[PDB]
Amino acid sequence: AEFPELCSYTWEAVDTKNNMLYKINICGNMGVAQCGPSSAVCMHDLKTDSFHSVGDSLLKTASRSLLEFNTTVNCKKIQSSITFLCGKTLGTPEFVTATDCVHYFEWRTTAACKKNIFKANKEVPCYAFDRELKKHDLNPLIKTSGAYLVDDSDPDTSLFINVCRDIEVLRASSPQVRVCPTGAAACLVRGDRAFDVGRPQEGLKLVSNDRLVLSYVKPDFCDGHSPAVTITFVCPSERREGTIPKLTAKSNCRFEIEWVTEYACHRDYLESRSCSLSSAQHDVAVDLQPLSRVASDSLFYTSEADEYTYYLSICGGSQAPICNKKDAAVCQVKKADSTQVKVAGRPQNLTLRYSDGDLTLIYFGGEECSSGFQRMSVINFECNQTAGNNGRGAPVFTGEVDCTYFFTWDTKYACV
Amino acid sequence: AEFPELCSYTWEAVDTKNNMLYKINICGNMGVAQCGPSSAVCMHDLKTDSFHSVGDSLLKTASRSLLEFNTTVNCKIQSSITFLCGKTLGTPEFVTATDCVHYFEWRTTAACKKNIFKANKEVPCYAFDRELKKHDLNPLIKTSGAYLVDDSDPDTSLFINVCRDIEVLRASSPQVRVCPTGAAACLVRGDRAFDVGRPQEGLKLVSNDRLVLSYVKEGAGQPDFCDGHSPAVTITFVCPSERREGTIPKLTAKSNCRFEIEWVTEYACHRDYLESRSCSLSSAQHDVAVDLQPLSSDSLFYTSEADEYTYYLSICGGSQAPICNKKDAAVCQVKKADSTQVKVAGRPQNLTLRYSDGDLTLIYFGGEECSSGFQRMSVINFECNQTAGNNGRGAPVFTGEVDCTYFFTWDTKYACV
Ligand SMILES: *[C@@H]1O[C@H](CO)[C@@H](O[C@@H]2O[C@H](CO)[C@@H](O)[C@H](O)[C@H]2NC(C)=O)[C@H](O)[C@H]1NC(C)=O
Ligand SMILES: O=P(O)(O)OC[C@H]1O[C@H](O)[C@@H](O)[C@@H](O)[C@@H]1O
Ligand SMILES: O=P(O)(O)OC[C@H]1O[C@H](O)[C@@H](O)[C@@H](O)[C@@H]1O
Ligand SMILES: [Os+3]
Ligand SMILES: [Os+3]
């Protein structure tokens, strides 16, 4: 009944500019009693250290893409508004803005898709705010197909895990993973046999300023011991190349795993809403702006596919005439019928990210696919000092997965 | 190469408007003199009884969906054949001739991007008569399944397809899936399936109004109960002197693995007797009067709801839904999960109203291409019903799609003979 997969948790959102923290319960039976037993959206004014409800559970209004919460509290009537968009993970509600009387939020989540195919058998909140109200988000690590191989000295066994959810085994990239039990968050393969050594229960936990842990709980070798998996994610003090998660203890079906990943650091250290990252904020100086101008005759790049042609103009770059009406960072054109023009990403919706050695430029807000998923494009930039076009290089379409378009782009401007 | 399955035959086309009969052979190896061994398009002038080539097979320029042939002659003479993906081998339709340049359009399976529409073996399925009137059996060709022939025999089941093999691999009926691949005629005598006839020669016009199709099965492996005889199937299609309900093919002889089948069908009659390019049929030309114009205070378009799409029909001059008021179509498809997707499933200028074997059918074609290359097409199966809602006008009921060909049922008082 209305996003069932989000109802058993208390979700947090913050308004950084005003130091306001929001506690959200889509089924507000809860406990945020801090605002009362009926409050669905509880606001903590950290300034005066006080709580005020800005959305009551009973005064709810629901539709496929919009949840509204009202109050009887007069305003200089206060209410909350949550715009839902289909996403490929449970996601997190993002604070958009707060007008005089209304508090707006946006939530990209698998629980808002037109098709159930995007919904995981079991997924839990995958983020947490630290003492400073900075978000540590692991959603980027969540696999929708397959899982991660854990490093261990046991050559006759493979340990597979996913993050914050079960491992999708039916379409797994690895043949081994495909032999795993359905619904398992951690799977152990031995002698062509796979065991379910841990399933998703509670959301991600933040223990140390720079440490997050995820616990999975549920076989011969267990000798009377319920299998358990505990992953500890650590934000390193210095930027380094990505590392595989490592096994630190396999004491009788009681697995301990440490994963050094910059995704465990606060998010603003990894991302920018513009085409540049700075040493001061991200410990890396990047500026892809010099790419918006290809200058010559076409300030847009083109990337050929089997059935389509992609036209890209990034960082405010000018677009091509065939898309001179859609306002698109990335524009997909059907070859058989050059009249079908789909937007695969918009310029106002850019996220430049650097984490674990990878520089990624993500454009979202594209036209929706039947699943309800706004088409989006992610560009995996690669450093190349000698890239053609004086180092600017050129994007290569590498493929599509359910309306997310992938490109690779070798360029000197992606060299840290 | 160049459409390999078209070269095995010589295809006729006609310009009745000028009494011209063309012999087409994409590979030029036709032999028929009066125009040469290299002539790809030979034009027999019936008014003078002379032949002149309008296209030489050697002077060929090929494009994706276009074949052109130049000759040595040259007025102040050449040929062009436009190819469009079709679901049967079809026929090269003469469209017009200019200042010594003859045009043709050919909707055929041999021009489909996705070779999923090609049969294991298909042959020409039409023939022109002395009056240059066409007798086309293409509509009876099944891209899936077969026709169960009426034999009255209790021990056997005899299945056939028209001008082509029965698609066994992906057929619904379990009994047909037991038939050998490539068989055009399948005999089930003993819970066993036998191939007693494969296609080879095209449709032949015997009686100036009688069509004959001959399937042969020569060589070793003849069934033991056939006694040194090679199986063979011979179907005679006969045009009824008067309109009547379509009948089933009838087995009229079954000597030694030799089958003689008679099929009384109005599809055997000249085409202009079964079809019109407008929404009306006359008693004089069609032997039946029909006018669907009246179906053309509220919305001037019809709507048929489907699971994933909505279909808007603008019939006989009617007007489309404002949502499709950006192209031009008689049938327009719009995806519900994304109203931005508007596809033309048929165009007003491409309509065929047909009456044959008791069924009244309105067809719109020229729709937008699918990845296969097939232009979308809508076929509206009309039914008689005096007590039809909307004051008899009734309304279209979408009944399903099949590879970019959309079907509809339409009960209306205007569909009554
Ligand atoms: C929410 O408060 C508003 C104000 O009285 C009520 O009216 C509108 O309700 C719709 C949906 O219910 C909202 O989309 C509008 O924004 C509301 N109007 C505005 C702008 O105030 C609404 O009835 C209240 N919700 C309840 C208690 O049902
Ligand atoms: O929304 P649908 O019907 O699932 O179609 C989705 C498809 O739409 C268009 O054809 C293109 O954008 C494809 O890349 C995309 O995958
Ligand atoms: O050309 P494609 O990629 O095979 O798609 C064909 C399909 O396109 C759209 O989704 C609709 O028109 C369907 O009815 C049609 O079958
Ligand atoms: Os073990
Ligand atoms: Os017999």
From Swiss-Prot, chain B:
Glycan-linked positions: N70, N350, N385
Domain MRH, first and last residues per copy: 5-114, 123-271, 277-417
Post-translational modification: Palmitoylated. Undergoes cysteine S-palmitoylation which promotes interaction with the retromer cargo-selective complex which mediates its retrograde trafficking to the Golgi apparatus.
Localization in the cell: Golgi apparatus membrane; Endosome membrane
Disulphide-bridged cysteine pairs: C7-C27, C35-C42, C75-C100, C85-C112, C125-C163, C179-C186, C226-C257, C239-C269, C279-C316, C324-C332, C370-C404, C384-C416
Record text on subunit structure and interactions: Binds HA-I and HA-II plasma membrane adapters. Interacts with DPP4; the interaction is direct. Binds GGA1, GGA2 and GGA3. Interacts with the heterotrimeric retromer cargo-selective complex (CSC), formed by VPS26 (VPS26A or VPS26B), VPS29 and VPS35; which is involved in retrograde trafficking of the receptor from endosomes to the Golgi apparatus.
Domain notes: Contains 15 repeating units of approximately 147 AA harboring four disulfide bonds each. The most highly conserved region within the repeat consists of a stretch of 13 AA that contains cysteines at both ends.
Function noted in UniProt: Mediates the transport of phosphorylated lysosomal enzymes from the Golgi complex and the cell surface to lysosomes. Lysosomal enzymes bearing phosphomannosyl residues bind specifically to mannose-6-phosphate receptors in the Golgi apparatus and the resulting receptor-ligand complex is transported to an acidic prelysosomal compartment where the low pH mediates the dissociation of the complex. The receptor is then recycled back to the Golgi for another round of trafficking through its binding to the retromer. This receptor also binds IGF2.
UniProt similarity note: Belongs to the MRL1/IGF2R family.
Name of the protein in its database record: Cation-independent mannose-6-phosphate receptor
Gene name of the encoded protein: IGF2R
Included range, full protein: 51 to 476 of 2499
